[PDB]
Amino acid sequence: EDLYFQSHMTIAVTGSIATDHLMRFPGRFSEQLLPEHLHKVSLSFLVDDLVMHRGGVAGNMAFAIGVLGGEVALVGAAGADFADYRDWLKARGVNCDHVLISETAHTARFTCTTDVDMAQIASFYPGAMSEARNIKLADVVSAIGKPELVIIGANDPEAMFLHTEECRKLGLAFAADPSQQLARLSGEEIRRLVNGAAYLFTNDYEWDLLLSKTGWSEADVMAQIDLRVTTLGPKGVDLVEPDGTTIHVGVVPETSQTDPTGVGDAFRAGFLTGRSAGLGLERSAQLGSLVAVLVLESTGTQEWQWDYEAAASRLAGAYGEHAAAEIVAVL
Amino acid sequence: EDLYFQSHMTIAVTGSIATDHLMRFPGRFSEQLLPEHLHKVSLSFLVDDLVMHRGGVAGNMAFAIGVLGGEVALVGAAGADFADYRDWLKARGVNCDHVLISETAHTARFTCTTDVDMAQIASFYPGAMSEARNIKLADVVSAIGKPELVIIGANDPEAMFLHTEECRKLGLAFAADPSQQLARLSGEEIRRLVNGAAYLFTNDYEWDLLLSKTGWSEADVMAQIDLRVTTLGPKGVDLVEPDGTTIHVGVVPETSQTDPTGVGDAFRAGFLTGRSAGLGLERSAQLGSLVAVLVLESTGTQEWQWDYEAAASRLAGAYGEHAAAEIVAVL
Numbered sequence: 332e333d334l335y336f337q338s339h340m341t342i343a344v345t346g347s348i349a350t351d352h353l354m355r356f357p358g359r360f361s362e363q364l365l366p367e368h369l370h371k372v373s374l375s376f377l378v379d380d381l382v383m384h385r386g387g388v389a390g391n392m393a394f395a396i397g398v399l400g401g402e403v404a405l406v407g408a409a410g411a412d413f414a415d416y417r418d419w420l421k422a423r424g425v426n427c428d429h430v431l432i433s434e435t436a437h438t439a440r441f442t443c444t445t446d447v448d449m450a451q452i453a454s455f456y457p458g459a460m461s462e463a464r465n466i467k468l469a470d471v472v473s474a475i476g477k478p479e480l481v482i483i484g485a486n487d488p489e490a491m492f493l494h495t496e497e498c499r500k501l502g503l504a505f506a507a508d509p510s511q512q513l514a515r516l517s518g519e520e521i522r523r524l525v526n527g528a529a530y531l532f533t534n535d536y537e538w539d540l541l542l543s544k545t546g547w548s549e550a551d552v553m554a555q556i557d558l559r560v561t562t563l564g565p566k567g568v569d570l571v572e573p574d575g576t577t578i579h580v581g582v583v584p585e586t587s588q589t590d591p592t593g594v595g596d597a598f599r600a601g602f603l604t605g606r607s608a609g610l611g612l613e614r615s616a617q618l619g620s621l622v623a624v625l626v627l628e629s630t631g632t633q634e635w636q637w638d639y640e641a642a643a644s645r646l647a648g649a650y651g652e653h654a655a656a657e658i659v660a661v662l
Numbered sequence: 663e664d665l666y667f668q669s670h671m672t673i674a675v676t677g678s679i680a681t682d683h684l685m686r687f688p689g690r691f692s693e694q695l696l697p698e699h700l701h702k703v704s705l706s707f708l709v710d711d712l713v714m715h716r717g718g719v720a721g722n723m724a725f726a727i728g729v730l731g732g733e734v735a736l737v738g739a740a741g742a743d744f745a746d747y748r749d750w751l752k753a754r755g756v757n758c759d760h761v762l763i764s765e766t767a768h769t770a771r772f773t774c775t776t777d778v779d780m781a782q783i784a785s786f787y788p789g790a791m792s793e794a795r796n797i798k799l800a801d802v803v804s805a806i807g808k809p810e811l812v813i814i815g816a817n818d819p820e821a822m823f824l825h826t827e828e829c830r831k832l833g834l835a836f837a838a839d840p841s842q843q844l845a846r847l848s849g850e851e852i853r854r855l856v857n858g859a860a861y862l863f864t865n866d867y868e869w870d871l872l873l874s875k876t877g878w879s880e881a882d883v884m885a886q887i888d889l890r891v892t893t894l895g896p897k898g899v900d901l902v903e904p905d906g907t908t909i910h911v912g913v914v915p916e917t918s919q920t921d922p923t924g925v926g927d928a929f930r931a932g933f934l935t936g937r938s939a940g941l942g943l944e945r946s947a948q949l950g951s952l953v954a955v956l957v958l959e960s961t962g963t964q965e966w967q968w969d970y971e972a973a974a975s976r977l978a979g980a981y982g983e984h985a986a987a988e989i990v991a992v993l
């Protein structure tokens with residue numbers, strides 16, 4: 332129980348800040364991946380496209396919360412080049428005061444290849460991200476008050492745990508969102524990010540990976556968190572309570588599958604924005620699913636637009652008139 | 663039957679010319695790759711290292727042939743930046759006169775991630791490589807005479823077929839070395855690169871991929887080529903005749919597994935250098951296996967050194983005194 336003043340109703344987004352290089356492979360990764368050679372892959376994809384966009388899970392989530400009108404602070408480490416990216420985020424209402432700017436290292440670089448089925452294979456070079464372990468959430472809280480929620484996104488692995496530990500000692504609600512880092516983190520490293528989480532967000536592959544590496548059963552996890560949110564690709568999203576009462580929300584149907592980078596980030600930002608505005612779980616995931624498909628339909632993670640009238644119409648189309656009106660009249 | 667003069671005894675190396683960005687993932691790709699999610703991977707590897715080196719299969723193979731004292735012409739397409747890379751290759755005796763230099767596009771970029779087991783996942787952005795389809799082997803042959811062998815390495819996909827067709831009409835012996843491009847090429851595209859090949863080079867994963875995508879059986883392939891050369895990772899290499907008489911040569915034992923990029927290229931260059939100097943199949947693969955391990959033990963594809971005394975000693979250690987003396991006294 333923390334006695335410091337409430338920031339109300341700020342979300343602090345911790346996680347990576349990067350430049351994304353996105354490329355397309357005009358074939359199927361699946362069609363390359365012989366089950367008997369998966370022991371030691373040797374894969375090389377000739378790509379037909381290369382474009383650069385602003386990225387990082389924390390930049391992506393902060394951007395979307397800001398577009399949706401939310402109060403949001405971005406907390407992460409970037410290189411000296413961050414000034415321009417800061418202007419882009421500030422233009423959508425993102426508070427960038429607490430971004431650590433490295434004196435010597437470069438903003439992180441994500442290099443990603445997407446195939447015809449929206450499968451993705453990517454590397455992430457941390458650069459200045461590694462200095463996120465030097466950021467103190469206590470100093471952020473000192474300046475802006477207690478956030479209603481701290482999102483713990485993929486980050487410098489040590490920073491992910493330090494931030495989570497700080498939330499636990501400061502009594503801040505947090506969302507465990509280790510998604511993009513699950514590959515790098517040991518089972519021990521994953522296990523220590525989970526206990527006491529207000530929300531755990533993953534996709535279903537990531538959920539299997541988590542359980543696979545933690546040695547946990549679903550029951551072991553559900554006993555430690557307030558809510559599991561597991562996106563299911565074209566099958567929508569499951570929201571599961573410790574009970575486990577399950578609410579399911581199907582996707583908003585896409586007009587294209589352009590580029591799936593940042594779709595999870597957008598779902599999380601829309602959903603949490605919904606939750607912050609007092610919408611229930613079903614309605615929050617419906618708003619999330621819309622921001623998600625808007626990202627899927629654009630190239631890059633922050634290259635989507637927010638048209639209030641177009642949103643209501645689409646929400647109506649997929650979820651009906653009640654959902655649409657409840658959502659739009661919360662924004 | 664071509665009546666033009668012999669270049670004697672030049673190898674023309676066709677294939678890619680690039681800058682390689684090599685990174686290391688301090689984990690296991692296998693441990694990430696759930697058999698039930700291989701239908702649509704979502705993989706992202708936080709890397710702990712990023713270094714840049716000269717690359718491209720044709721640059722790598724030309725470099726090695728030149729280091730070994732062979733006469734070699736490099737034939738491929740590069741950007742205006744190629745002048746510096748040209749000096750590096752020329753320093754090892756590589757003829758770069760027939761490299762097409764793009765007026766507008768950039769030298770190709772390879773971005774590669776290697777895990778603790780030497781597995782590798784990579785993208786390749788072609789840039790100027792796409793202009794290789796405009797190179798005429800006839801003009802190269804015009805200038806330097808008929809090569810004893812043209813290597814058809816991974817390249818602009820259309821260029822790989824055009825070059826092969828030119829070899830077929832000019833009556834030039836060729837080695838089909840589609841390795842790195844097998845992922846991008848359709849079964850139809852692979853099938854038209856094979857007929858009449860003096861050598862077909864792949865690793866065993868690539869051999870399975872080839873057979874998988876061509877719809878061919880091993881017998882279908884062996885009926886069209888003079889020799890199949892299939893590297894087997896730590897198990898060495900099989901050299902198989904249409905018969906199919908098989909010669910097997912085990913690896914030269916490594917002192918490190920540093921970086922496996924370019925190991926296949928080096929094996930091919932050493933082997934073909936052996937063949938050009940009148941060594942038999944077994945002895946040529948023994949020389950190949952040595953250049954291969956020298957690459958494995960260094961970072962980058964062209965960052966290995968050639969010490970004549972160290973070579974004899976190592977060859978002696980793995981293959982015995984006869985092999986070593988026969989090989990060294992051919993160079």
Ligand SMILES: Nc1nc(F)nc2c1ncn2[C@@H]1O[C@@H](CO)[C@@H](O)[C@H]1O
Nearest residue numbers: 347386387441455485486511593706
């Ligand atoms: N391994 C990773 N670690 C961290 F910290 N961030 C990563 C990783 N992989 C992808 N990203 C970022 O996530 C994407 C959108 O979800 C992109 O915007 C990208 O910048």
Ligand SMILES: Nc1nc(F)nc2c1ncn2[C@@H]1O[C@@H](CO)[C@@H](O)[C@H]1O
Nearest residue numbers: 375678717718772786816817842924
């Ligand atoms: N898909 C590909 N297409 C082409 F033409 N070249 C590629 C590809 N993947 C890797 N490389 C190059 O091969 C490596 C060494 O074998 C490296 O030096 C690298 O430059």
